[PDB]
Design an enzyme around this catalytic site. Sequence first.
Site, short mmCIF file in Angstrom:
data_model
loop_
_atom_site.label_atom_id
_atom_site.label_comp_id
_atom_site.label_asym_id
_atom_site.label_seq_id
_atom_site.Cartn_x
_atom_site.Cartn_y
_atom_site.Cartn_z
N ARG A 164 22.82 -14.20 -36.14
CA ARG A 164 22.84 -13.77 -34.74
C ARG A 164 23.05 -12.27 -34.61
O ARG A 164 22.26 -11.58 -33.98
CB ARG A 164 23.96 -14.51 -33.99
CG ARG A 164 24.04 -14.19 -32.50
CD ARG A 164 22.80 -14.66 -31.75
NE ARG A 164 22.96 -14.51 -30.31
CZ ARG A 164 22.03 -14.84 -29.42
NH1 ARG A 164 20.86 -15.34 -29.82
NH2 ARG A 164 22.26 -14.68 -28.12
N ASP B 255 12.68 -22.86 -16.54
CA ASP B 255 13.73 -23.86 -16.39
C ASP B 255 13.69 -24.38 -14.96
O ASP B 255 13.84 -25.57 -14.71
CB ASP B 255 15.08 -23.23 -16.70
CG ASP B 255 15.13 -22.64 -18.09
OD1 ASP B 255 15.56 -23.35 -19.02
OD2 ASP B 255 14.73 -21.47 -18.25
N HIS C 17 19.64 -17.94 -19.61
CA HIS C 17 18.38 -18.61 -19.94
C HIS C 17 18.63 -19.74 -20.94
O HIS C 17 17.79 -20.63 -21.10
CB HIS C 17 17.42 -17.60 -20.57
CG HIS C 17 17.81 -17.20 -21.96
ND1 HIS C 17 17.48 -17.95 -23.06
CD2 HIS C 17 18.57 -16.17 -22.41
CE1 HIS C 17 18.02 -17.41 -24.14
NE2 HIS C 17 18.69 -16.33 -23.77
#
Lengths: 327, 327
Positions: free
Chosen positions: A98, A159, A187
Amino acid sequence: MKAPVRVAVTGAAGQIGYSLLFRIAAGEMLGKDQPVILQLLEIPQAMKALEGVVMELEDCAFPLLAGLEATDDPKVAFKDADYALLVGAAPRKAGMERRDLLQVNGKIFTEQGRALAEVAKKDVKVLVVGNPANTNALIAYKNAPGLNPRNFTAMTRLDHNRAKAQLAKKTGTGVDRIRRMTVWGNHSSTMFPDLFHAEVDGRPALELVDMEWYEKVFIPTVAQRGAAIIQARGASSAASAANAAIEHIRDWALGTPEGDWVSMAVPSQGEYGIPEGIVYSFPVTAKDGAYRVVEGLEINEFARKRMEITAQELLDEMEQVKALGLI
Amino acid sequence: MKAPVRVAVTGAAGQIGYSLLFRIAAGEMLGKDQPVILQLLEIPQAMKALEGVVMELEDCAFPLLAGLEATDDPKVAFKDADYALLVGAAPRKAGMERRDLLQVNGKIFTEQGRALAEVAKKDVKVLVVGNPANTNALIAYKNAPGLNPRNFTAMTRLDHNRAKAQLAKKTGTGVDRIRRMTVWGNHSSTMFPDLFHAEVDGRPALELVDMEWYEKVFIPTVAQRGAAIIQARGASSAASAANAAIEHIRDWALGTPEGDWVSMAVPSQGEYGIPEGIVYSFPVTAKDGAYRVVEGLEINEFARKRMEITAQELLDEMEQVKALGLI
Ligand SMILES: NC(=O)C1=CN([C@@H]2O[C@H](COP(=O)(O)OP(=O)(O)OC[C@H]3O[C@@H](n4cnc5c(N)ncnc54)[C@H](OP(=O)(O)O)[C@@H]3O)[C@@H](O)[C@H]2O)C=CC1
Ligand SMILES: NC(=O)C1=CN([C@@H]2O[C@H](COP(=O)(O)OP(=O)(O)OC[C@H]3O[C@@H](n4cnc5c(N)ncnc54)[C@H](OP(=O)(O)O)[C@@H]3O)[C@@H](O)[C@H]2O)C=CC1
């Protein structure tokens, strides 16, 4: 015919780009009477592929495509841009974690934010699609001093659309009769699809569906939809994501329908108590290039809790980026 | 206000389908005032992937998509169909000769032609995209008893658009100012792009470009364009092919511009002396859902020779499928 507008699109040789560019050139994003000049950006290694996309665009003989240019220089791609769709983002290669991903994205969006501030139109409308969208938008506008921070948005429209689709399916009603859907926050998976203000043929959604379904079926399904498509098709949902990007820009530049609203992740100004600065999805109405958060909505505990959770995830992402010296 | 029309599309889980279906659902093929019911067909092994495509279509929340159904049965996909786009065709298998490809396609199009004749609207409009397009269309209509052979067409619109694009680029004029382009014959390498009647801003094309360029550069470039896309992108030109399929159906249904015409491969009735029956690309105009070959055009030796060569190739292919007992 209106004077042509310049639309910059990054990551142009990728999957989303392949499902996005043709519809834009066809007039689906800004109107059938609005000529567009596509300014496409890619990384050096993908320029050959981008030339192929350029050729396919030419082969569509689009009457609205007033100009077409491919480059690997952000300062060329964003030059005099009226719109900028930032699709390219850091790809996850083996070995990368990450933090490493944030490093690369940090470089991409700091450079692009600076490029936009240097050569694009002052009122350039920016939509970030590349993930993590909300945080990448934050990096971009923070590094875009000289440009209206509110012009830097992130996409949650996919979405939003998926949520409308699920509600329509469950109630056996056409998706065209679903209004006031809202997706709040990030998101990501903490994204919160709000049914409390949604209406089906004018009737409150919660009068047609119960809380059990909402919590145990609706939320999880909207969150896992992307994965469902990959498991079925063996590829990401590029076409529907491209459609959502088109609608995000379209409803912003032109306008939202009367009595309805859409979802857009935008820099918070404290609306609904959401921390200022973070790019957060809110219900918004828009008209000819300007949007406004729909404030004043009653928020119950079920919604508040989830809005807080996603707000916290965004705050943490912001702190992580701040610790990396990206903002 | 208008009642929905049923649009059947085969090979729906493939590359062209992925670039085709969303724009059809958006109203780009039959009008923004025309609701559509998509009836999608795939082979059994691709039904899971097709389900993925269905999900993506739902996730676009298209107001014009009145219905959506996936099936592996041609008699279901073509039921009451108003339009049918036959994209699926025999895959190019290893150690599989040309003739072998023809045999597989023979089975596919013999069955689909039969299905269309049994369950589709009597005036169903059919476009064959799956290769070899012209010959597959021949197999289909010859196996569609009770249906109008002229309603069975093959696609040459991509070659047509590519030709317009090349002319626009060479003359430095917008593609929107190019009219009367014609591509004659087969969808193959023998296709003949005709500039003798084409006009650039009203001026004869050959007054702006020379015969040398036309013969040694223009024709070969249009013929090799598909390969050029593959060498650049590493994938076939699905997006521009989908665009051409859309325009083929669109202009046929909604009509061609006054003073202009397009290219469509249709069953020959002897126009220009072309043998009857073979599906041959001709310059055509369209109105109220019907098309008509543009006759009366002057054909010099250069054109005649090339029109003859491609006609002969189509006759040879016809002979091959006849020998395989497909017609
Ligand atoms: N021009 C520039 O500055 C840059 C360009 N690039 C280029 O960008 C391109 C990336 O293309 P490719 O790998 O095909 O990627 P995609 O087009 O499929 O995805 C691009 C971005 O969209 C995100 N995304 C969000 N929602 C979706 C969705 N529903 N489906 C797919 N993606 C979604 C992806 O995140 P997720 O990873 O989670 O899918 C990713 O960050 C490459 O061609 C690369 O060369 C890369 C970096 C900078
Ligand atoms: N529903 C049915 O009855 C059938 C369905 N199928 C399905 O059809 C699908 C084929 O998909 P996929 O392999 O991705 O193919 P594509 O969508 O890329 O191609 C489908 C057809 O279009 C032709 N074509 C013409 N012009 C172009 C162009 N510019 N670019 C690409 N293709 C072009 C191809 O010919 P070429 O080979 O020369 O590219 C091929 O015959 C598969 O999903 C398969 O399962 C298969 C058989 C029957």
